[PDB]
Amino acid sequence: MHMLRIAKEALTFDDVLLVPAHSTVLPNTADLRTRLTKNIALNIPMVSASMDTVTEARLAIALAQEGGIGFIHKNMSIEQQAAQVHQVKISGGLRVGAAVGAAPGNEERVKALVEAGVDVLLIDSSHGHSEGVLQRIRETRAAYPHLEIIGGNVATAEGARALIEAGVSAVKVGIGPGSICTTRIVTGVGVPQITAIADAAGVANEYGIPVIADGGIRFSGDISKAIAAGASCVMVGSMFAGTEEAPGEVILYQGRSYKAYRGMGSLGAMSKLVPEGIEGRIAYKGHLKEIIHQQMGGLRSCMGLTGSATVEDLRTKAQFVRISGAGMKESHVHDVQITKEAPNYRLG
Amino acid sequence: MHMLRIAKEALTFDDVLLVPAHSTVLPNTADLRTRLTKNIALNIPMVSASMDTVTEARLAIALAQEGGIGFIHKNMSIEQQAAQVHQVKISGGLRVGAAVGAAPGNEERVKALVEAGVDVLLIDSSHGHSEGVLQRIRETRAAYPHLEIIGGNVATAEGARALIEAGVSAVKVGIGPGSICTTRIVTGVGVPQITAIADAAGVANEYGIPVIADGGIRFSGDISKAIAAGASCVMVGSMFAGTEEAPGEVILYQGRSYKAYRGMGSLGAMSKLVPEGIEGRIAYKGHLKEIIHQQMGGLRSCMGLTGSATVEDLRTKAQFVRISGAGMKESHVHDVQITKEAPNYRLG
Amino acid sequence: MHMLRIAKEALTFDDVLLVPAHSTVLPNTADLRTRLTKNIALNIPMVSASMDTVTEARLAIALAQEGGIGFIHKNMSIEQQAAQVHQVKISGGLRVGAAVGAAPGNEERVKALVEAGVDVLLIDSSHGHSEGVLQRIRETRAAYPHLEIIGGNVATAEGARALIEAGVSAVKVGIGPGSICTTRIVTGVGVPQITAIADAAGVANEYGIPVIADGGIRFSGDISKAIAAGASCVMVGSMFAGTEEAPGEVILYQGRSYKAYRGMGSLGAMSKLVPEGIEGRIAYKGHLKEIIHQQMGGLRSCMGLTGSATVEDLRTKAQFVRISGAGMKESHVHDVQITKEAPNYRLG
Amino acid sequence: MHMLRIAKEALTFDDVLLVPAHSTVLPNTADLRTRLTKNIALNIPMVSASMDTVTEARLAIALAQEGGIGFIHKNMSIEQQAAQVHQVKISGGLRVGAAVGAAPGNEERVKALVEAGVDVLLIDSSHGHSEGVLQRIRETRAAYPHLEIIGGNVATAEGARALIEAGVSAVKVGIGPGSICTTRIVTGVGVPQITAIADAAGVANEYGIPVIADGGIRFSGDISKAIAAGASCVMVGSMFAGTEEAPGEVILYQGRSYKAYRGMGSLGAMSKLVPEGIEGRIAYKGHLKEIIHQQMGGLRSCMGLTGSATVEDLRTKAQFVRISGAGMKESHVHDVQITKEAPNYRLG
């Protein structure tokens, strides 16, 4: 019978914790280096979302200087987007990426971006397993046989495989886990992100193709978990939004400091439309460099606790335990009133 | 032993998500057409609840114009109910339904409604598996052999089967999931709605009889899930209550705009009574046509994500994953303050 | 290995719902009659807690008049307790019970209560499986071979069995589920109440001995569930506290009307003590008769939905489904603002 | 496949309850005596955290007088720490412990503490399975063959074993359950505490080595559970913070009385640092002696309910049931407004 076609149970970040192990690794000796694509290395496993409230040249420069790579968003003219890529390239040999989406008629944007020296092109869609997206990847790969191309987003083994066979240099994973996302609520479609990363990685591992975990990262411990689940690096929006280097001005509202943060599927980013994201504000965070130091500090401390000398060790060898709701509540601060916010644990 | 007679675990909407798949379907090319009954087609898979704060001729007209069908409520005289059915029929060949409940002595209401040209009669009860309800269905089917009859509500395979054998043209499913319902709390009786739809559909599928999923639909993603669970269309109360076309005037209260919305089992709708619903208010929503566009937009986007070309594909082929509480929390917007409500994600 | 000695998973009320079935039963034709003990019948399956903020003669009279039985509390002199039992007996042949606890030196209280015509003696302890309690039961049974004796509380098969072999006429079940109870938090000891009732009943059924489900009943649906789990009737404190007939005066506080309600293990009821209950206030509820009508209305409607003609049918034949947290949230009223509290669903 | 490397499910305090059993034990006849180490007995199973807002000589004296042992913290000079150990020793032959952490260069602190008469040395780390910690234990054990040494923290069987083989006299268990801890959130690493205690004890039991359960104890029932899980005693911070005897002055804030309580991994305790704890305030609690009486009262009442004559009986024979979220909610006080806080159940 099995009238209800339930393929399996799926987990996200708050369903699991990493198990501590024998370790000779110290936090400050952990090696954070990793891969974005088969041919592009990173010194830290962080990439910035291709969103108009997160990544232009300014943030892409600060991030590349810390060892990551920024993806310049496409909500600007072809000329401005190429100028922004070029600005990153002439700021000290830094690497940069750029998003172009998946619609037809992006050829001229793609050509401008390759000419401006873009290191990696992101063909990104809310549905990477769409035949349109797969065909744009094939055409771009035939047109530019040596361009590094990231394609996404998928949330399944099958999708990771279709992207790899279409020619991607990395698979980006995540359908609906984003802070600003309403896709799962408005469509009913999604896969909890830890299960999505692991399913994608089980395929991509076979071809040596890295998986980028995109969306849903809120605390530095979610980075650790995303990597242990199979990701080679993570993509973040909300963790970098609100930084000084992110686009837009600081807004003061009811004693607090904010920057705008919105989904690229929100009515405002898209300009009757049916949106799959919201328009919001995110607490001002100060300089990207300090945020990065705190988040990588957490990852470093995990690598010490797990005995993971390198990111590959965390990604292929660390183990999880599955926890309940009570388990998650124990993991947070509890039964004490906080008198000073820690820089790596800001709730409100 | 098994002293505790637990038949199985049961799931509702927030326990599951739909898995994305290979798709050539685009949202605006998805085919939304479906069946209400074996012989009555709909252009969209939405029917309105037979409630006195949701459906009279006005809403039934607007909905039929969008491709759905409205069920005129029975809290009015036989004459007014027939006049309302007739008003829908002479508003451009629109289809209309009407509720009559299940008590004896409804014969003359039934005759008036058939004469006024009603397309589908709803014999609706809070307990469709009641022998009284089954006998009213049999008598109505012998009296009107070609009248389309919907019978409900049930929440089990056995109940769906008893309704089919009594002569129904469609089975309506749902015991207790409604927004305004206190049945499960006051009686202890109910079945989580995704499991209820799937159990009913496993039976009804064998006879080609559609299942209508009634109650508990809050976001457009719940529509997708209800169909993937086996429903051919959904019935909604609260999603249409508060629209301009729903009965009753707009109430202004503490800066906000409302319309009355109440269970038909509430003390007010029934006039010592023991109620199984409450009397409430629901946010003013504006015109039904825009609400419908947003909800069908979500369903369309699901069909694109799932590669479901038609509603039948979603209903018989899409797959689910089971999620935890943490999974559901990730699916909503999280860790960002919303500055503008999206029209398809209004919380408060 | 199994270092963690976990005997099994256990459930309470909000973990389960009752499945609707074929029914010829109508709510107002359901038979509510049941057994308190092997030899004492009740017209409704409700008994009142032996608490000093719930049951003296006044409430015990009103309840017996509705078909239940009240247990007079022991926080008064032997003489006052016998006078209260006698007052119920001379108010029209009504049945009455009285609590005496389990400490040595209760012989003279017991003799006074039997002489005042008590129908049923409650030897009640927070730990019915205590050897002291079992020996007081044996001695009382040898002293009064025809006195109906209820012993409790237990939460296991083994405990139910030890009480039966000690000579009880009914087993009372519940360790820690009470509204006003902190036992499980302060000791770490308890069994979720639906599992506790079913385990006890699996034993008691073999001897024809009824089980009384004591504590944790909040809504009328919990009564249905407690019986379907194996109870012959339920004992309630908080549902009857705050009624006009319960002991104590109405307190007005911040616009609302209250009566005191406290655990018998609270510091105030016991007068360095280590309490296992709290002192509180409970909303004023009006007359017991109307409360009873609402709660039995819910039970009646369950019996209609489940096709349970008698309480025995509900107790031995109805089936459950296990639900998630999302299931429970769907069961309550949701996504609507309540404008008028229903008499059987008062939250605040 | 099993791409997601999930070793097993893990539980903490709120996931389980203890099952009541046949008992001849009365609360006030229960024997609370236990072991801290193989060679050091305690009269009650409570030790105080080595934190600068919890334990100096003053609290260590009051606790030892009640039958426990206090661990003097190391955020002071070697001389002050030895003077504090000495003060406890000359306050009536009381036992005392002292923390030294795990970094190299602690030799001279260790020598000063042994000379000042410390009974037990705590070599404590946030990662007891670190090779650095294991080597400091070996060196300290070769240097002081008869010094009782506690090593920690671990959360696994493997870790308990590595500590035992390094020479510890007791294993301290807990990675991340502390009130003031953000390790699990900032690193992603941790094990729910009931599972952590049981896994560690399965190893330590084989060598007769006690396990100390450290962190996450909020109510006296958590003590019972920690012992039944395999601990010989518990270590607490927040339960003793805010007592009169704990370090620091009472702070009055918004009508309420507090003392500072902070993680030893917090930015303030450590003085760019990446912290693993927060700085907070905890309600003023009054004298340690009364707190201890309430907490041991709860444990005593558990031993009565479980028929556990001694702590060893609770630790090796008591059984658990696994509960849901609804189970935990039933265990707390519910559906009543508390008018007087009980001394053993203070929420706010």
Ligand SMILES: COc1c(C)c2c(c(O)c1C/C=C(\C)CCC(=O)O)C(=O)OC2
């Ligand atoms: C492309 O950026 C995304 C991504 C990566 C994801 C989602 C999403 O909604 C958007 C915005 C949707 C946009 C800009 C409309 C164009 C399109 O539909 O491709 C999602 O739910 O999971 C992943």
Ligand SMILES: COc1c(C)c2c(c(O)c1C/C=C(\C)CCC(=O)O)C(=O)OC2
């Ligand atoms: C009939 O409308 C419903 C339906 C469809 C359902 C329930 C319900 O309470 C009412 C109102 C109950 C009324 C009007 C009283 C008459 C009766 O009892 O039939 C429910 O809980 O699941 C389904």
Ligand SMILES: COc1c(C)c2c(c(O)c1C/C=C(\C)CCC(=O)O)C(=O)OC2
């Ligand atoms: C006896 O009334 C109870 C019962 C029935 C239960 C509990 C309880 O705390 C009390 C009050 C405890 C009292 C009055 C102290 C005397 C004693 O201990 O027997 C409980 O937790 O489950 C069941």
Ligand SMILES: COc1c(C)c2c(c(O)c1C/C=C(\C)CCC(=O)O)C(=O)OC2
């Ligand atoms: C040592 O005290 C602890 C313990 C016992 C634990 C944790 C922790 O963060 C600290 C403070 C961390 C400090 C003082 C920094 C030095 C170090 O790292 O050892 C934890 O998460 O589980 C157990």
Ligand SMILES: O=c1[nH]cnc2c1ncn2[C@@H]1O[C@H](COP(=O)(O)O)[C@@H](O)[C@H]1O
């Ligand atoms: O409007 C949107 N709806 C849904 N997902 C979006 C939208 N805009 C961007 N995203 C995705 O959300 C991610 C950011 O998630 P975050 O880091 O949790 O804030 C982006 O990298 C995209 O994958």
Ligand SMILES: O=c1[nH]cnc2c1ncn2[C@@H]1O[C@H](COP(=O)(O)O)[C@@H](O)[C@H]1O
């Ligand atoms: O008083 C009531 N109690 C319980 N269910 C009701 C009541 N009135 C109507 N219903 C059901 O609730 C459904 C509406 O649910 P909603 O769409 O979640 O607001 C209706 O279609 C009926 O099935």
Ligand SMILES: O=c1[nH]cnc2c1ncn2[C@@H]1O[C@H](COP(=O)(O)O)[C@@H](O)[C@H]1O
């Ligand atoms: O102080 C107490 N602590 C724990 N349980 C108590 C206490 N006083 C009474 N009880 C139990 O709690 C029951 C009432 O539970 P209630 O109906 O949920 O309010 C009583 O019948 C007793 O079994």
Ligand SMILES: O=c1[nH]cnc2c1ncn2[C@@H]1O[C@H](COP(=O)(O)O)[C@@H](O)[C@H]1O
């Ligand atoms: O900063 C910190 N971060 C994490 N754990 C800490 C920190 N400081 C102390 N601890 C641990 O937390 C325990 C106290 O937990 P508590 O009793 O739940 O308040 C201590 O005994 C240590 O094991």
Ligand SMILES: [K+]
């Ligand atoms: K914690």
Ligand SMILES: [K+]
């Ligand atoms: K989301």
Ligand SMILES: [K+]
């Ligand atoms: K409901």
Ligand SMILES: [K+]
């Ligand atoms: K309780």
